[PDB]
């Protein structure tokens, strides 16, 4: 058999606890974060030419 650890949240838990069976309850398996979008780059006024 085999578990695809990135298929869905349930599969992730199975991989997390190294088992094909889960008895019951709530389990933390990983953390998460939001990915940044665009690039905001700022430079000084610049007057000196």
């Amino acid at each position: 058999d085999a578990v695809d650890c990135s298929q869905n949240p349930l599969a992730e838990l199975k991989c997390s606890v190294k088992s094909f069976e889960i008895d019951k309850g709530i389990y933390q398996t990983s953390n998460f974060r939001v990915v940044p979008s665009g690039d905001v780059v700022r430079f000084p006024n610049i007057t000196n030419l």
């Binding site: 695809d4 298929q7 599969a11 992730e12 990983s30 940044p36």
Partner: protein, 90 residues
């Protein structure tokens, strides 16, 4: 824009935020039960019929009972029973 994310995943209408965090995929009822799988802030989750599904609910604190006070009468037992309790310690 989320990391991690799963290949097969979607969000339904079962979305509700509580102080302890938001749930996705768990329904939400207006009733109460014994706390089975705790979430936090008075909220627990369990698996119930609707066909079954995961639901969120406000946990019950205990049975609903009330006795009237009387300064005139007293209640006393007129029978008894015997039972045995099992307890384990490492």
């Amino acid at each position: 824009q989320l990391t991690p994310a799963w290949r097969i995943y979607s969000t339904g209408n079962n979305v509700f935020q509580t102080q302890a965090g938001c749930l996705i995929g768990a329904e939400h009822v207006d009733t109460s039960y014994e706390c089975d799988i705790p979430i936090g802030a008075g909220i627990c989750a369990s698996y119930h019929t609707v066909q079954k599904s995961i639901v969120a609910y406000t946990m019950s604190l205990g049975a609903d009972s009330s006795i009237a006070y009387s300064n005139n009468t007293i209640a006393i037992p007129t029978n008894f029973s015997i039972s045995i309790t099992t307890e384990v310690m490492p």
